[PDB]
Design an enzyme around this catalytic site. Structure first.
Site, short mmCIF file in Angstrom:
data_model
loop_
_atom_site.label_atom_id
_atom_site.label_comp_id
_atom_site.label_asym_id
_atom_site.label_seq_id
_atom_site.Cartn_x
_atom_site.Cartn_y
_atom_site.Cartn_z
N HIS B 28 0.82 -1.25 0.00
CA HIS B 28 0.00 0.00 0.00
C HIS B 28 0.84 1.28 0.00
O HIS B 28 0.22 2.34 -0.27
CB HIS B 28 -1.08 0.01 1.12
CG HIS B 28 -0.64 0.40 2.50
ND1 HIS B 28 -0.60 -0.50 3.55
CD2 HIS B 28 -0.31 1.61 3.04
CE1 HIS B 28 -0.24 0.12 4.66
NE2 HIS B 28 -0.05 1.41 4.37
N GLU B 52 -0.11 -7.72 1.22
CA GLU B 52 0.58 -6.50 1.72
C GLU B 52 2.10 -6.72 1.77
O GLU B 52 2.78 -5.82 2.24
CB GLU B 52 0.02 -6.09 3.08
CG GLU B 52 -1.26 -5.27 2.99
CD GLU B 52 -1.04 -3.82 2.60
OE1 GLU B 52 -1.38 -2.94 3.40
OE2 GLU B 52 -0.52 -3.56 1.50
N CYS B 137 4.45 2.43 8.02
CA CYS B 137 4.21 1.18 7.22
C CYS B 137 5.40 0.92 6.30
O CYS B 137 5.95 1.89 5.71
CB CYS B 137 2.89 1.21 6.45
SG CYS B 137 1.43 1.09 7.52
#
Ligand SMILES: O=C(NNc1ccccc1F)c1ccno1
EC number: 3.6.1.15
Lengths: 172, 171
Positions: B28, B52, B137
């Site tokens: 992402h 992911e 992230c």
């Protein structure tokens, strides 16, 4: 951790010290250059130096850091407080190591007798080495934590065990 | 000379150099409009995505200064890993995480698949450096085993409370 706390952490001898106020500097006794007779332009005679084992406090007669506000210094913290140890490392990298603090302890570390507040690092399981743990160059780095609205300093890095998991904060 | 030099700012988050040619990141955070990464045309970049988890393999050495590291598909249940968080302040935040089961979790709406973990930094941060934020992230999960550093995935998501984290894993 706030840039104002990082501004107080000053390179000193074989490690670090911390400006509590414009006139008050705290550090680990063993990092102090032993033959030194002058600090920030000031002679020994004109400074009040208070020593309790591996805790040393310098009070100057003139303001050395007038850019700074005076903040709270306490004699360690309650058991189970989480602190950050404000460590500077090669290349303007800042390493605020998470530590859960325990009891006041006397221990033997690399043969030397140490007394202060014990803590366990919260960085990883086996924190020996510079990536997740402390190194001898980190001594004098301050232990800090946030209360209601403000930050408190409660000691200076004095030692760590061979395993790296336990650290000792020398206290006023 | 450090694990930390392998953590690199990338897209809307971070990634990790496993070797001179291999970079891993959270799907992402990757830019959706691009013709090159690290000065290499996408032409010559192999991309392996698995939810992911994304691995990039370059055709030349981008980080010839690095040795290759062990990459595994998650870790054994109950392993204490470190998430190597880099912040734009210049702060390095290694946080202990006790790793759990592979699962799908409701994390603030979305369903996320990977290895669940729980931060060991206490209840809540309360404005201390003790938890993850959305910008973290892509930060790697690592642990020491014998003399070897193992990387076992990348930070994919965290709950409102901060307690639960999801490490996205290979395959
Ligand atoms: O699992 C936790 N705590 N106790 C624990 C830690 C390491 C290994 C075994 C353990 F029982 C935990 C999750 C989140 N906060 O604490």
């Amino acid at each position: 951790a706030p840039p104002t706390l990082w501004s107080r952490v000053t390179k000193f001898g074989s490690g670090w010290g911390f400006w509590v106020s414009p006139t008050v500097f705290i550090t680990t006794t063993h990092v102090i250059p032993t033959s030194a007779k002058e600090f920030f332009g000031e002679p020994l005679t004109s400074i009040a130096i208070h020593r309790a084992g591996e805790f040393t406090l310098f009070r100057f007669s003139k303001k050395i850091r007038p850019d700074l506000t005076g903040m709270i210094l306490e004699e360690g913290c309650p058991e189970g407080t989480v602190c950050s140890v404000l460590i500077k490392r090669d290349s303007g990298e800042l390493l605020p190591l998470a530590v859960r603090m325990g009891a006041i302890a006397s221990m033997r570390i690399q043969g030397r007798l140490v007394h202060g507040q014990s803590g366990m690092l919260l960085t990883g399981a086996n924190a020996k080495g510079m990536d997740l743990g402390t190194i001898p160059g980190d001594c004098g780095a301050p232990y800090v934590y946030k209360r209601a609205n403000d930050w408190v300093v409660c000691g200076v890095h004095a030692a760590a065990t061979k395993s790296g998991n336990t650290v000792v904060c020398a206290v006023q």
